[PDB]
Amino acid sequence: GLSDGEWQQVLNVWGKVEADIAGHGQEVLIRLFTGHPETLEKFDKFKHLKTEAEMKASEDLKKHGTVVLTALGGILKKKGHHEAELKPLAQSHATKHKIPIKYLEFISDAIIHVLHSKHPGDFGADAQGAMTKALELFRNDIAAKYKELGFQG
Ligand code: HEM
Ligand SMILES: [O-][O-]
């Protein structure tokens, strides 16, 4: 798991996200969709977004970014004790949304990118290490639930 110090770094970084959750969420999703267009196809309600300008102008995309990062933030604040919060998300993403674990890797990478992009010089090496560990733990616990379900994608 993560040490006390590492969790503290994670939650300090998260304070930066919370100052503009919609903006961070929007940029995370745009990074995901532009870097990996196959991910956009999982969202019937975002398929019409043909260009990045359209993505940037989508108020619904910002709304969804808020929903995603709010869920993630609640999970991070549990500092690993997140079974009850994580289980339903793992199950909805496997059974309903059909999201391969690879796409969770993609979005994890997008979060790290957006943190540097929005806070250049203010996302230190220790903070990146801690946030990476937290996102890996999240992904790994989802992966365990995916294996239970026999879900691949
Ligand atoms: C940080 C990781 C993620 C978190 C915390 C997250 C969270 C959520 C939440 C809270 C919802 C609404 C409730 C639900 O359906 O369970 C949702 C819906 C959804 N998620 Fe995710 N999600 C994540 C990653 C992804 C990724 C990587 C994809 C696809 C590439 C994805 C695809 C979807 C889709 C298609 C919906 C339904 C959207 C709609 O039509 O309203 N999710 N997600
Ligand atoms: O996308 O959640």
From Swiss-Prot:
GO molecular function, one term: oxygen binding
GO CC terms in record: sarcoplasm
Protein's UniProt name: Myoglobin
Any single Pfam family the record assigns to this protein: Globin
Gene source species: Equus caballus
Subcellular location: Cytoplasm, Sarcoplasm
EC numbers on record: 1.7.-.-, 1.11.1.-
Subunit structure: Monomeric.
Main location: cytoplasm
InterPro entries: Globin (IPR000971), Globin-like_sf (IPR009050), Myoglobin (IPR002335)
Signal sequence region: none
Family matches, as CDD domains: Mb
Catalytic activity: Fe(III)-heme b-[protein] + nitric oxide + H2O = Fe(II)-heme b-[protein] + nitrite + 2 H(+); H2O2 + AH2 = A + 2 H2O
Biological process, per Gene Ontology: oxygen transport; removal of superoxide radicals
